[PDB]
Ligand binder design. Structure first.
Ligand SMILES: CCN1CCN(C(=O)c2ccc(Cn3nc(C)cc3C)cc2)CC1
Length: 120
């Protein structure tokens, strides 16, 4: 019933949460995730945020094309040809970022667990 849903889920290697989809309930409190960057991983429910999109006014981390990142705040959403863009405000200035360029630090993801988390 969670299969096919979009999530933002913790990748254990760096502790950031990345965009992906639940592809399977694999039991033992874990789901098979397909991350948008092509990584298939089994992830604990407690590490999966069922938010699609990440809400307005959330503090997030956004990547540029050259892999530079910094914190910002979600100030908008836009759908184009089935794809989602986020308007992220950094130092008072906004740019549009594709879904998979918006990630959460461990602290930023932790903040959404109570409302959007799976498992416990
Ligand atoms: C979801 C799976 N996918 C898998 C591919 N990814 C990476 O190989 C990856 C690993 C480390 C970094 C560097 N970084 N960036 C931040 C921020 C924090 C840290 C330590 C960057 C990228 C990204 C994640």
């Amino acid at each position: 019933s969670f299969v096919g849903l979009r999530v933002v889920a913790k990748w254990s290697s760096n502790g950031y949460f990345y965009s992906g989809k639940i592809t399977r309930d694999v039991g033992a409190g874990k789901y098979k995730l397909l991350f948008d960057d092509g990584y298939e991983c089994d992830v604990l429910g407690k590490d999966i945020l069922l938010c699609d999109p990440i809400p307005l006014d959330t503090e997030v981390t956004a990547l540029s094309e050259d892999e530079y990142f910094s914190a910002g705040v979600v100030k908008g959403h836009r759908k184009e040809s089935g794809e989602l863009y986020y308007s992220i405000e950094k130092e008072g200035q906004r740019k549009w970022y594709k879904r998979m360029a918006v990630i959460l630090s461990l602290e930023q993801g932790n903040r959404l667990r109570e409302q959007y988390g799976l498992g416990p």
